[PDB]
Amino acid sequence: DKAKSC
Amino acid sequence: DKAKSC
Amino acid sequence: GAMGSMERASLIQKAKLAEQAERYEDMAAFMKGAVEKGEELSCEERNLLSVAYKNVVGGQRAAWRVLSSIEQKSNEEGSEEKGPEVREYREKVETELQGVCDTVLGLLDSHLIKEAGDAESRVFYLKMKGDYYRYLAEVATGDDKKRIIDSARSAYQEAMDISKKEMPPTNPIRLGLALNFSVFHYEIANSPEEAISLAKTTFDEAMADLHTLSEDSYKDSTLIMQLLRDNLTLWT
Amino acid sequence: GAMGSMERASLIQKAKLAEQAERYEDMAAFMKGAVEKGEELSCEERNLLSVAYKNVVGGQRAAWRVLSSIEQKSNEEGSEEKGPEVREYREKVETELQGVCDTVLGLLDSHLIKEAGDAESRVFYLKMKGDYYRYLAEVATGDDKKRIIDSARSAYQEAMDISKKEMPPTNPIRLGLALNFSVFHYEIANSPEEAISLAKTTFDEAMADLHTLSEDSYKDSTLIMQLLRDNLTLWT
Ligand SMILES: C=CC(C)(C)OC[C@H]1O[C@H](O[C@@H]2C3=C([C@H](C)COC(C)=O)C[C@H](O)[C@]3(C)/C=C3/[C@@H](COC)CC[C@H]3[C@@H](C)[C@H]2O)[C@H](O)[C@@H](OC(C)=O)[C@@H]1O
Ligand SMILES: C=CC(C)(C)OC[C@H]1O[C@H](O[C@@H]2C3=C([C@H](C)COC(C)=O)C[C@H](O)[C@]3(C)/C=C3/[C@@H](COC)CC[C@H]3[C@@H](C)[C@H]2O)[C@H](O)[C@@H](OC(C)=O)[C@@H]1O
Ligand SMILES: [Cl-]
Ligand SMILES: [Cl-]
Ligand SMILES: [Mg+2]
Ligand SMILES: [Mg+2]
Ligand SMILES: [Mg+2]
Ligand SMILES: [Mg+2]
Known part of the structure; x- marks a missing residue:
């Protein structure tokens, strides 16, 4: 699943 | 308040 | 194009x-x-x-x-x-x-x-x-606002006349049309009583026609009928 | 323009x-x-x-x-x-x-x-x-994919070097940079172990620096630290 980024 | 529409 | x-x-x-x-x-x-x-x-x-x-x-x-x-x-x-x-x-x-x-x-x-x-x-x-x-x-504010309002009313009214003559009360397009014409009365035409009367009559007449429908058609109509009910609760 | x-x-x-x-x-x-x-x-x-x-x-x-x-x-x-x-x-x-x-x-x-x-x-x-x-x-799939990947790595790496020398471990930009470089390792560079090591080290070093912060700065850092924790839970 797509990982969280910022 | 804004009424619901469709 | x-x-x-x-x-x-x-x-x-x-x-x-x-x-x-x-x-x-x-x-x-x-x-x-x-x-x-x-x-x-x-x-x-x-x-x-x-x-x-x-x-x-x-x-x-x-x-x-x-x-x-x-x-x-x-x-x-x-x-x-x-x-x-x-x-x-x-x-x-x-x-x-x-x-x-x-x-x-x-x-x-x-x-x-x-x-x-x-x-x-x-x-x-x-x-x-x-x-x-x-x-x-x-968004209208100028010299053509009244004609813009009447163009909306005129289009809605012709659609209402046809739908009442040619469609059953539970038809989703007829229901959505009446929902929006009622919103037009309340939010555009400064006619809240007309908006409330139309939503009630639309809802009640569709209620009385649900018995003719299959389970799928029954689900289709009630979704828009709930929006009519939502607006009535908001407006009354 | x-x-x-x-x-x-x-x-x-x-x-x-x-x-x-x-x-x-x-x-x-x-x-x-x-x-x-x-x-x-x-x-x-x-x-x-x-x-x-x-x-x-x-x-x-x-x-x-x-x-x-x-x-x-x-x-x-x-x-x-x-x-x-x-x-x-x-x-x-x-x-x-x-x-x-x-x-x-x-x-x-x-x-x-x-x-x-x-x-x-x-x-x-x-x-x-x-x-x-x-x-x-x-979205890259052609003869320049490897150079595109290395351009991302090179930019991230120079940013990491500066941030480690010039910024405290809890700085939100330093934290967001490390979060994304870790995502780069996992999703782009096929280096899941590097992604996990970077997220852990980033989180732990920020944890140990929270005591220096005001209540507002404390809230700012922990928001991005939670994203590091989220990815670690997803990846491990
Ligand atoms: C076009 C997009 C897709 C998703 C393919 O279809 C949109 C939808 O198109 C149909 O629903 C129409 C329709 C809506 C239904 C009330 C949505 O039903 C749901 C989600 O359960 C909302 C849409 O905006 C749409 C197309 C708009 C009209 C509206 C148009 O005025 C000019 C009048 C009322 C309503 C009518 C035409 C609905 O029949 C179908 O009956 C819906 O199928 C189900 C399960 O109800 C489908 O979701
Ligand atoms: C620009 C839009 C507004 C809404 C005015 O500001 C965006 C936000 O700008 C700041 O937050 C930045 C920032 C983010 C914060 C983590 C959001 O904090 C919240 C909502 O509580 C998300 C934004 O995308 C932004 C600008 C992005 C960066 C990111 C940039 O990489 C190149 C690195 C990490 C992060 C840093 C720069 C954050 O400091 C501020 O510290 C935030 O204020 C609070 C209450 O935390 C504000 O919400
Ligand atoms: Cl196309
Ligand atoms: Cl402008
Ligand atoms: Mg052709
Ligand atoms: Mg024809
Ligand atoms: Mg100037
Ligand atoms: Mg300068």
Whole structure:
């Protein structure tokens, strides 16, 4: 699943 | 308040 | 038209892909190209057209209301002068919103409405015409506001007359039309009593016709009937 | 530039209005015009630039993944040939996404990065450079994929080196940079162990520095630290 980024 | 529409 | 070289079937196919991708500007451009092929739209194709522009104009309307609220606060007693930027940007969004409405209305007038003979298609397009004149009315402030309002009323009224003669009370298009005409009465035409009377009568007459429907049709009608009930609770 | 005639201050003002209205294409166009005035950006103005394009490219990436998934299913064993439309529309979205990435990278290269002397600004822009080469990498498939990946790595690495020398472990930009470089390792560079090691070390070193912070700074760091924790739970 797509990982969280910022 | 804004009424619901469709 | 930038879509003039693409097959009609490919435009429909890509409008469905755009919907799945929530790319509603693309969806609307594909369906505009499809309409401009000159053939009438199927029931499913009409839904793609309306969903596309409904979402595009829906986002514009929400942004316009945010900006108009900021603008109204800036013109209150005690607010510091911030310059012309708020009015400028509200006008930018407003002008883009009006261009989309003009584009939809141009499609309905060239030539979807005149070639629509079946009640389901003619009522559908006349509802759209009323909807997009109503969106023009939401932002209208000048010498043509009254004619814009009457254009919405006139389109809604012809659709209502047809739908009452040709469609059962539970038909989803007839229900959505009545829901929106009631909203028009309340929010545009300063006729809250008419809006309430229409929503009640629409709801009650559909209630009494549910017994004729299959389980799937029963589910279809009650969804829009609940919106009529929601507005009545909000308004009363 | 279509924004060449508007005051810098008015562009910033309207970028803030666009943000409140969730009009991120407008927001990005206003901030592009602001950058092209040639003056360096303040801390707040840098955040407006990054938020604008982050949201624009974010929606493009989500649509690209929807379309790419449909395309991949269409090329499976047993799928009926549907023609070139799915590939065509995926390429359309992909090409628009690449144009936005090229536009951001052009702004960073002309001339935000070279005029950025303070760690907070230079690390910020180098993180952006890595982010948008990473988004190019997500869709890259040809003879330049390896150079695109290395351009992301190189930008992230220079930002990491500066941030470790010039910023405290809890600095939000340093934390967001490390979070994204870790995502790069996992999703782009096929280095899941490096991604996990970086996220752990980043989290633990920030944990040990929280005692130096005020209540507001404490809240700022822990928000991004939780994202590091989220990814570790996902990855382990
Ligand atoms: C076009 C997009 C897709 C998702 C393919 O279809 C949109 C929808 O199209 C149909 O629904 C229409 C329709 C809506 C239904 C009330 C949605 O039902 C759901 C989600 O359960 C909302 C849409 O905007 C649409 C197309 C709009 C009209 C509206 C048009 O005015 C000009 C009048 C009322 C309403 C009518 C036409 C509905 O029949 C179908 O009956 C829906 O199927 C189900 C399960 O109800 C489908 O979700
Ligand atoms: C620009 C839009 C507004 C809403 C005005 O500001 C965006 C935000 O700008 C700042 O937050 C930045 C920032 C983010 C914060 C983590 C959000 O904090 C919240 C909502 O509580 C998310 C934004 O995308 C932004 C600008 C992005 C960066 C990111 C940039 O990489 C190039 C690195 C990490 C992060 C840093 C720069 C954050 O400091 C501020 O510290 C935030 O204020 C609070 C309460 O935390 C504000 O919400
Ligand atoms: Cl403007
Ligand atoms: Cl296409
Ligand atoms: Mg043909
Ligand atoms: Mg006909
Ligand atoms: Mg000036
Ligand atoms: Mg400098």
